[PDB]
């Protein structure tokens, strides 16, 4: 149950399917040709948000991309503003914004806070930091969906039978509420960070010619890459 696991080789993935489906054994073989390792994330409602959190912060840790940090802080300001224009009172989201902004700056090396891979791991492995950051991402997602209620409405009405506003309050904002495609499009646009989702299931339309397919979210290979198996996200590391 650690919110985010140690780096494992893909052999542990392949051991889960070793005695089972040949399609999956092959897809995992093929996934090994592009990805070295995975980080399992705990399978609660927030696995996509937790995967994203850690993958992005690890990206800024490893890259020291100060320009990416500036850029995303602008996107975060504009989000702050749209939640303002939507009647959200600051005391309902701005604490989440402050916690995340501070994580982001702590991952930049050079100054006092400055943390390394291990303290980032324990921070995202500690309920009382990880959860606040999940919530930050949920509020950015909610903001982005309501800002575009008209575009997302036909997809949301079919997903749930809710209104966009309903959806936002019952499906996006609360802790634990599972995310889906709408959530991902919204967060990726809202923050402007690309995501590659490798889809690992048993589908095989072309017998004997197997590939792993993937869906790209792009507002330049996505530096966030997630493993998805119907129902659950972990983090992938490319070669």
């Amino acid at each position: 149950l650690p919110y985010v696991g140690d780096k494992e080789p893909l052999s542990t993935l392949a051991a889960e399917f070793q005695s089972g489906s040949p399609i999956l054994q092959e897809k995992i073989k093929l996934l090994g040709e592009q990805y070295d390792a995975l980080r399992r994330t705990r399978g609660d409602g927030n696995c996509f948000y937790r995967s994203f959190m850690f993958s992005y912060l690890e990206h800024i840790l490893e890259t020291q991309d100060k320009a990416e940090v500036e850029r995303i802080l602008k996107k975060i300001e504009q989000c702050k503003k749209t939640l303002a224009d939507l009647g959200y009172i600051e005391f309902t989201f701005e604490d989440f914004f402050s916690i995340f902004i501070d994580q982001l700056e702590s991952v930049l090396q050079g100054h006092e806070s400055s943390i390394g891979a291990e303290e980032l791991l324990e921070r995202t492995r500690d309920q009382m930091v990880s959860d606040y950051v999940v919530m930050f991402f949920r509020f950015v997602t909610s903001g982005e969906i309501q800002r575009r209620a008209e575009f997302f409405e036909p997809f949301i009405s079919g997903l749930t039978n809710s209104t966009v506003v309903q959806f936002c309050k019952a499906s996006v904002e609360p802790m634990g509420e599972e995310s889906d495609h709408v959530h991902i499009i919204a967060l990726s646009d809202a923050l402007g960070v690309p995501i590659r989702v490798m889809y690992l299931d048993r589908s095989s339309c072309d017998a004997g010619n197997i590939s792993v397919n993937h869906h790209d979210f792009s507002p330049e290979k996505p530096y966030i890459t997630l493993l998805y198996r119907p129902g659950h996200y972990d983090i992938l590391y490319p070669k």
């Binding site: 889960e16 705990r42 409602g45 397919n213 119907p230 659950h232 996200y233």
Partner: protein
């Protein structure tokens, strides 16, 4: 007859279909156009999701009706499954999975014939056509696998 499918990035996919086609036929046509496996799609019309053994007719879908395409990307949820041999495995699931889908996932990992499987939770046998949400089984529950032949 043509129909259109709108995607969450604003693309519009044009399909050639017949009113008697099933939703699975349409998903196959979408796979050919877009490269999305049919098991990964969710088609929507008039605020309703479209079920695989039903036809365009069944949903009143006529010439140049516009559908909507969402990818099956829901998460997080893992549950445990303990066999009676002390092996515990993890399973990736969704609250909408039928117990049948769950057994097909157990076959994906352990190769156990779904016809042989019985899943126990909370003192009862779990029924093939109900869902994990029917049972209010959430993340990190432990289902118990039991085998019977015939």
């Amino acid at each position: 007859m043509q129909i259109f499918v709108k995607t969450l990035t604003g693309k519009t996919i044009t399909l050639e279909v017949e009113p008697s086609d099933t939703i699975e036929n349409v998903k196959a046509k979408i796979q050919d156009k877009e490269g999305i496996p049919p098991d990964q799609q969710r088609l929507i019309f008039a605020g309703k999701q479209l079920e695989d053994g039903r036809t365009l007719s069944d949903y009143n879908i006529q010439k140049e009706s516009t559908l909507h395409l969402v990818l099956r990307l829901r998460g997080x949820m893992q549950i445990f499954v303990k066999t009676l041999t002390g092996k515990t495995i993890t399973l990736e699931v969704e609250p909408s999975d039928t117990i049948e889908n769950v057994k097909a996932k157990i076959q994906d990992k352990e190769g156990i014939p779904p016809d042989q499987q019985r899943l126990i939770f909370a003192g009862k046998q779990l029924e093939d056509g109900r869902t994990l949400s029917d049972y209010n089984i959430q993340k990190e529950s432990t289902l118990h696998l039991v085998l019977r032949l015939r």
